[PDB]
RNA sequence: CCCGGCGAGGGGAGUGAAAAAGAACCUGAAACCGUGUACGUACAAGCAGUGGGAGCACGCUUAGGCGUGUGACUGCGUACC
RNA sequence: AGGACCGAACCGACUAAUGUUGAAAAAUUAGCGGAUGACUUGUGGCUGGGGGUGAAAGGCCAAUCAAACCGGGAGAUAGCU
RNA sequence: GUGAAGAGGGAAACAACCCAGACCGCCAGCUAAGGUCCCAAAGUCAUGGUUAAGUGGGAAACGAUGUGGGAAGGCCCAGAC
RNA sequence: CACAGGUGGUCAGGUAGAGAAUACCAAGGCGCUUGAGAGAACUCGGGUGAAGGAACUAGGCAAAAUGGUGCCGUAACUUC
RNA sequence: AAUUCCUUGUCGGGUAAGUUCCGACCUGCACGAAUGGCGUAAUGAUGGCCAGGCUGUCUCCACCCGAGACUCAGUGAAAUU
RNA sequence: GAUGUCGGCUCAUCACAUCCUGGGGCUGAAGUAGGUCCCAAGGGUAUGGCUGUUCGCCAUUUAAAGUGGUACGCGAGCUGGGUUUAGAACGUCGUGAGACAGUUCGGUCCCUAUCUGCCGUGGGCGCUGGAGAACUGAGGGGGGCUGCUCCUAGUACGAGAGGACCGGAGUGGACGCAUCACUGGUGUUCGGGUUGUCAUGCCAAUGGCACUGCCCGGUAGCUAAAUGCGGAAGAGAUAAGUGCUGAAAGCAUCUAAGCACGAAACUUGCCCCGAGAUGAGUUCUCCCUGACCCUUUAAGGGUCCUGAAGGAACGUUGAAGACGACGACGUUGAUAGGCCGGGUGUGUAAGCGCAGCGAUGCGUUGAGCUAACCGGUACUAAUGAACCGUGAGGCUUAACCUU
């Protein structure tokens, strides 16, 4: 359907309020490297529970 | 059987060739029955060696279906094609006294004590 | 009267001495474990709580672990409870099984869960495809007119179009027990036990028929 | 529908599924180290390991079978020779996946796969 | 005035009865006598939320001992 | 699920095979049809491999005439009376269609072919 | 001088009377998108306005419901051509 | 041999499923019909709006046709909105 | 008459009805049409008659021993109806 | 418009196949760029279907309904 | 009958049964001899009917795969107001 | 400056003057049956054909084939069939252009939803210190239909033939929910077979591709065509109605006071959603017992010390499902992948023996290959933590606490 008036800018703010993407909290350290990572996941270029990861 | 406008094989001594479903029985609000149903037939063809002539309307029951009838072991015996033995439309039991081709398991209950008792077939 | 929590576990076509053999559903109903048992100040109504399910119980919320600790130990995150007019049992486990289901020869299998997700498959919200006249196109399965007008009642209550199956607990009400079996606790129920295969259920007895 | 079943089906019909696993298992056998999506990385575990298993002992019919699953001269030479006698001292887990992060070309969940005796890395970087 | 509502039916419409109200705690008869005596929407609601009634002559929701009153 | 897939092994009886279907054999069965009980027997070749899923059954093809008559007997129930073993043979595939349109002067198979 | 990728774009530092003149550069509405403060929004609703107003910052209100800006809540109330 | 046929490339579009704020101002997939003929068709040339041109539908004239366009009369006129 | 060409009061409201004629200000009084248990501003008014039906607060034909008052009248404590 | 549309001349390699249908293919073109994952209704293409065989419907509803080549074998009507 | 005011004409036939079809009939619309008539092989992507093959068009729909929907990331309209 | 049509399909919805069972008066009703007949919204209320069709005509199912409304329901649903729809042209008429609801041939129908509803679903907040667990019912809907015959019962009645319900019972038919063992279907993560070409140097052998090339079988899943199956004894308030006691009207009398009985509906019993129920909730189980400065102080601000129980992101992932949420659960780990034992599928893996002068088949080998499934196995990968959550938590009446 079409509309009947021009909508509000208060609406535009309301519709995107419950959509915006999440994150982990706190700047990490790891048990085996001075590298920060995403927590509870492999350090992207260093050691997290032995080994390194990633290519290309 | 499962539908109408459905020709199926004679397996009776009252018509020839094929004979024609005018409706399926055993329930309303549905133009399809399950296996083991009662059909209403009109004879589409007939021959003089069989007892009845065309466009007469009679009752019938299933004697073969290539899906099988749930009656015999818990595992449906699937006999070749759809085929039907005509009944009487009031007085019950087969009007035809023969079957064409082999014997069936579909003729060994209470309603079939006039066709197996004969020596020329299902004996 | 007491509802016994089963598990969907088994399916069997068992023969009977007549010329038909019967498909049946097999329910292990063993270890129904009390840890509370309520009485008639405890939420004001006397009823019995029983627990049947699958949990390691090492990494488990301490408010839950003490619930199990002060009485019968159990596993399972969720627990189920049932009203009664019979003698209530000691709260440190009772593990009562299939034997309850011979004093009635019908059960109400009630379920927990529902196992299909949507059931747009002509099961819970049903359809008929558009029967083809004049060269029909685009819509065949989207409902034609769900309302009426602002005098019949705009769009009426009690209509589904799309959504979810619910994942609630569903009855078939008063379905037959085929057999009860000691020494390994097997319930033969004849069919329509809810959920996907391997899902939990509740099985209470029939109070209606 | 997906109930009482475990495993992943991608966004390909079967002839392409055959081709993509014959591409990727050749890429594993040439490079020894791969990165791919988490759904692929699983199907990459399930494709290669029943072939390693067949391949511990030397069997001409099981070589015919590996060439039936993936058509390649590189792969049937590596198995039963270099990787077969290598993975002979195990009973599974002949490779391990490390959960590497999100894609860099666009966006999808990736996991790295790395043979169970290996711990090497390389990179493309210009910084 | 038997307080019909839309709630989904066939052939008719489903309703609450006056008769239901007595069997499911004594309050509801007393309750839709004082409700209907208050204004509009929002004010009639701000007023309403200050009434309590319950089962009556037996209800625990009186432990305060308020100011006693005969009217 | 902790008693299923075990329950496929339990139903399974010592006659159930792992073969190329097409031994002749004879299926002895009851005539339970109506309120009475006699016997009747069935012979042919079994063209399908039994015991699919939980329960075994015989799918005989008759092969004496050209007509697609397949018959299904449950192996695990008492309605099936007795089970005798006869002449050897092979079909491999669970289907034998070229005999359901014309076949005759034929009954038995005694080798699995060469 | 700082950040960045060879970049884009901006700041600091210095120019100048001015960059609240930084290159589309005159001063600069209104449409336009976002920040920052005050107070407000989870018994809560309609031409969004008028009448009545707890409350909060600032005015000794001459504290007697007021000025200024806002405002829980609510009586009353149908756009313009 | 054939203004016979089935049929590509080469040309068309009866039906059917879809597309229907498309991939595209009828095209697609697939059935279908001309293709040795009143066929298919390149180059160069020619008629200009109630005028051409039409195995004719009152069709076709720059993905448009039962009526192509601009510079002037022109502020056309409207018992009119 | 009113709207058209006028605010307000009352009516579940309205174009148009009834009271009424908007200079403007007034935590002023009075009266209208309309109201007075709460909604909602004022009488569950003082005194008496009657309906059992939410009639009141939805209409006619139409009927009856549904119920009461009133004057004239038949019957009418001698016995009514 | 990197438009599934339209458009003339010359040249003519291999196997299977009725042939320049068509599968694969010598020479060659070329990835016609949303991706990747899930597998809700549903929309569209594609697959596959019990039993019936149009029964759907005004209407067989494209292919999945028919197909090719060799061989045997052949009707009323007919301007032959 | 492409032709019938009435009429789904009347009767026979195929038949789920079939306004239509096929046959006969006239109670005959305004039929009727170049608005041409009657009969006819071939032919038409041409209409209706018939019996048989087959098939998800359908009884009644199930499930598989993929592209949108949906998920994450990107670019990025419109009817309207 | 748009309240826009027939016909077909879909999808509904409400009024009861109910098609029907059900309780009941009457009858010129003996009984059976019907006519007459009131209560009743509770529930089942049929379909294919021709025809664009209403209405028609015809066959038929089921015990059964109802009435009325809805911008003559529903083109911000579908097709676009119908009227010359726009087009000849038949039939018809006028000098003709042009027309015709007689007609035959095919033939352009839009909106991704602003607010509103309807159904499914998440975020955030009050739940009174916090946390996790069960949970009551303020509130509100669903089953709800209806034949058959055994018994009830060949009995009252009637001349005789004949002759019914409630209640128990199984079962058909409609209606609806779940289900995947059975019977089929499918199963692009499993086997074999097979045309063809291309290919592994070549052959014995074997394989990419052609719609998953094609065809049949297929674990686990899902599913209807298949499967299992509710539709309930009882109770109260009652309708129409049999009345008892009784007044208007000396009494009688369903009537005004008063009371037994009287239907699926209604209140329920049976079933299901439910504390946002601000009336803010109960009850079970766990945890937190340190301190000063400052301002408005049932309060908050700053800081040292310090925050448990628990939570969430994250992560492998599901038998949970649009996404989420919900759920197993991160080495205290069987989640998924492999892998082992087994299962179930297919139909004997290359080589060898043997048949076949070859493709290939069969005995060596009930083999080999194999997916989702059952149980084992830590083989593999799910970091050690951090962070949000704090140091016993309002006034006041009533109860208790030395109070």
From Swiss-Prot, chain B:
Keywords: Ribonucleoprotein, Ribosomal protein, RNA-binding, rRNA-binding. CDD domains: Ribosomal_uL14. Changing residue 98 to A: Reduced RsfS binding. GO terms for biological process: cytoplasmic translation. Changing residue 114 to A: Reduced RsfS binding. GO terms for molecular function: large ribosomal subunit rRNA binding; structural constituent of ribosome. One of its GO terms (cellular component) is cytosolic large ribosomal subunit. InterPro entries: Ribosomal_uL14, Ribosomal_uL14_bac-type, Ribosomal_uL14_CS, Ribosomal_uL14_sf. PROSITE patterns: RIBOSOMAL_L14. Pfam families: Ribosomal_L14. SUPFAM superfamilies: Ribosomal protein L14. Binds to 23S rRNA. Forms part of two intersubunit bridges in the 70S ribosome. In the 3.5 A resolved structures L14 and L19 interact and together make contact with the 16S rRNA in bridges B5 and B8. Part of the 50S ribosomal subunit. Forms a cluster with proteins L3 and L19. Forms two bridges to the 30S subunit in the 70S ribosome, contacting the 16S rRNA. In pre-50S ribosomal subunits interacts with RsfS, which may inhibit association with the 30S subunit. Belongs to the universal ribosomal protein uL14 family. PANTHER family: 50S/60S RIBOSOMAL PROTEIN L14/L23, LARGE RIBOSOMAL SUBUNIT PROTEIN UL14M. This is Large ribosomal subunit protein uL14. It comes from Escherichia coli (strain K12).
Curated annotation (Swiss-Prot), chain C:
GO terms for molecular function: rRNA binding; structural constituent of ribosome. One of its GO terms (cellular component) is cytosolic large ribosomal subunit. The keyword rRNA-binding applies. Pfam families: Ribosomal_L3 (PF00297). Keywords: Methylation, Ribonucleoprotein, Ribosomal protein, RNA-binding, rRNA-binding. InterPro entries: Ribosomal_uL3, Ribosomal_uL3_bac/org-type, Ribosomal_uL3_CS, Transl_B-barrel_sf. GO terms for biological process: cytoplasmic translation; ribosomal large subunit assembly. The modification N6-succinyllysine is found at residue 38. The modification N5-methylglutamine is found at residue 150. SUPFAM superfamilies: Translation proteins. Methylated by PrmB. Belongs to the universal ribosomal protein uL3 family. NCBIfam families: L3_bact (TIGR03625). Part of the 50S ribosomal subunit. Forms a cluster with proteins L14 and L19. In pull-down experiments interacts with CedA. One of two assembly initiator proteins, it binds directly near the 3'-end of the 23S rRNA, where it nucleates assembly of the 50S subunit. This is Large ribosomal subunit protein uL3. The gene is rplC.
From Swiss-Prot, chain E:
Keywords: Ribonucleoprotein, Ribosomal protein. It comes from the Bacteria. The keyword Cell division does not apply. One of its GO terms (cellular component) is ribosome. GO terms for molecular function: large ribosomal subunit rRNA binding; mRNA 5'-UTR binding; mRNA binding; structural constituent of ribosome; zinc ion binding. One of its GO terms (biological process) is negative regulation of translation. This protein is one of the early assembly proteins of the 50S ribosomal subunit, although it is not seen to bind rRNA by itself. It is important during the early stages of 50S assembly. Part of the 50S ribosomal subunit. Belongs to the universal ribosomal protein uL13 family. This is Large ribosomal subunit protein uL13. It comes from Escherichia coli (strain K12). The chain holds residues 72 to 142 of 142 of the full protein.
Curated annotation (Swiss-Prot), chain F:
Signal peptide: none annotated. It comes from the Bacteria. One of its GO terms (biological process) is cytoplasmic translation. Induction: Part of the rpsP-rimM-trmD-rplS operon. Transmembrane segments: none annotated. InterPro entries: Ribosomal_bL19, Ribosomal_bL19_CS, Ribosomal_bL19_sf, Translation_prot_SH3-like_sf. One of its GO terms (molecular function) is large ribosomal subunit rRNA binding. GO terms for cellular component: cytoplasm; cytosol; cytosolic large ribosomal subunit. Coiled coil: none annotated. Keywords: Ribonucleoprotein, Ribosomal protein, RNA-binding, rRNA-binding. This protein is located at the 30S-50S ribosomal subunit interface and may play a role in the structure and function of the aminoacyl-tRNA binding site. Part of the 50S ribosomal subunit. Contacts L14. Forms two bridges to the 30S subunit in the 70S ribosome, contacting the 16S rRNA. In pre-50S ribosomal subunits interacts with RsfS, which may inhibit association with the 30S subunit. Belongs to the bacterial ribosomal protein bL19 family. This is Large ribosomal subunit protein bL19. The lineage of its organism: Bacteria, Pseudomonadati, Pseudomonadota, Gammaproteobacteria, Enterobacterales.
């Amino acid at each position: 359907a079409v509309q009947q008036n021009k909508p509000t800018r208060s609406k535009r703010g309301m519709r995107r309020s419950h959509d915006a993407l999440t994150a982990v909290t706190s700047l990490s350290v790891d048990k085996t490297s001075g590298e920060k990572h995403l927590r509870h996941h492999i350090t992207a270029d260093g050691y997290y529970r032995g080994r390194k990861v990633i290519a290309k | 059987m499962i539908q109408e406008q459905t020709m199926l094989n004679v397996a009776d001594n009252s018509g020839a060739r094929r004979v024609m479903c005018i409706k399926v029985l055993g329930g309303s609000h549905r133009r399809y029955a399950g296996v083991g149903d009662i059909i209403k037939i009109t004879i589409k063809e007939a021959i003089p060696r069989g007892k009845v002539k065309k466009g007469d309307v009679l009752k019938a029951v299933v004697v073969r279906t290539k899906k099988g009838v749930r009656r015999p072991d818990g595992s449906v015996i699937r006999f070749d094609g759809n085929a039907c033995v005509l009944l009487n439309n009031n007085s019950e039991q087969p009007i035809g006294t023969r079957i064409f081709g082999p014997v069936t398991r579909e003729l060994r209950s209470e309603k079939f004590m006039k066709i197996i008792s004969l020596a020329p077939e299902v004996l | 009267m007491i509802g016994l929590v089963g598990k969907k576990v088994g399916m069997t076509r068992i023969f009977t001495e007549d010329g038909v053999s019967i498909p049946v559903t097999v329910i292990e109903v063993e270890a129904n474990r009390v840890t509370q048992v309520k009485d008639l100040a405890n939420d004001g109504y006397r009823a019995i709580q029983v627990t049947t399910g699958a949990k390691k119980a090492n990494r488990v919320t301490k408010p839950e672990a003490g619930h199990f600790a002060k009485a019968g130990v159990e596993a399972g995150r969720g627990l189920w409870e049932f009203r009664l007019a019979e003698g209530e049992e000691f709260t440190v486990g009772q593990s009562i099984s299939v034997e309850l289901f011979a004093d009635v020869k019908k059960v109400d299998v009630t379920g927990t869960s529902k196992g299909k997700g949507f059931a747009g498959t002509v099961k819970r919200w049903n359809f008929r495809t558009q029967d083809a006249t004049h060269g029909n196109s685009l819509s065949h399965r989207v409902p034609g007119s769900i309302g009426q007008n602002q005098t019949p009642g705009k769009v009426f209550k009690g209509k589904k179009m799309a959504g979810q199956m619910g994942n609630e607990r569903v009855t078939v009400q008063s379905l037959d027990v085929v057999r009860v079996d000691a020494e390994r606790n097997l319930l033969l129920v004849k069919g329509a036990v809810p959920g996907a295969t391997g899902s939990d259920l509740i099985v209470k007895p029939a109070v209606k028929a | 529908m997906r109930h009482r079943k475990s495993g992943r089906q991608l966004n390909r019909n079967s002839s392409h599924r055959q081709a993509m696993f014959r591409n990727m298992a050749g890429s594993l056998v040439r490079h020894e180290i791969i990165k791919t999506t988490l759904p692929k990385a699983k199907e990459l575990r399930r494709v290669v390991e029943p072939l390693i298993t067949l391949a511990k002992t030397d069997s001409v019919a099981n070589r015919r079978l590996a060439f039936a699953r993936t058509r390649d001269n590189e792969i049937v030479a590596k198995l039963f020779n270099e990787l077969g006698p290598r993975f002979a001292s195990r009973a599974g887990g002949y490779t391990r996946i490390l959960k590497c992060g999100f894609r860099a070309g666009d966006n999808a969940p990736m996991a790295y796969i790395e043979l169970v005796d290996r711990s090497e890395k390389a990179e493309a970087a210009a910084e | 005035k038997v307080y019909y509502h839309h709630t989904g039916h066939i052939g008719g419409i489903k309703q609450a009865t006056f008769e239901e109200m007595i069997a499911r705690r004594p309050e509801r008869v007393i309750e839709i006598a004082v409700k209907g005596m208050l204004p509009k929407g929002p004010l009639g609601r701000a007023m309403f939320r200050k009434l309590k009634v319950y089962a009556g002559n037996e209800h625990n929701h009186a432990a305060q001992q308020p100011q006693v009153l005969d009217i | 699920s902790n008693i299923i897939k075990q329950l496929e092994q339990e139903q399974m009886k010592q006659d159930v095979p792992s073969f190329r279907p097409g031994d002749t054999v004879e299926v002895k069965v009851w005539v339970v049809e109506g309120s009475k009980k006699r016997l009747q027997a069935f012979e042919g070749v079994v063209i399908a491999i039994r015991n699919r899923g939980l329960h075994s059954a015989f799918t005989v093809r008759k092969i004496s005439n050209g007509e697609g008559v397949e018959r299904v007997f449950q192996t695990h129930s008492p309605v099936v009376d007795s089970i005798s073993v006869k002449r050897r043979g092979a079909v491999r595939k669970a289907k034998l269609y070229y005999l359901r349109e014309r076949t005759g002067k034929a009954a038995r198979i005694k080798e699995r072919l060469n």
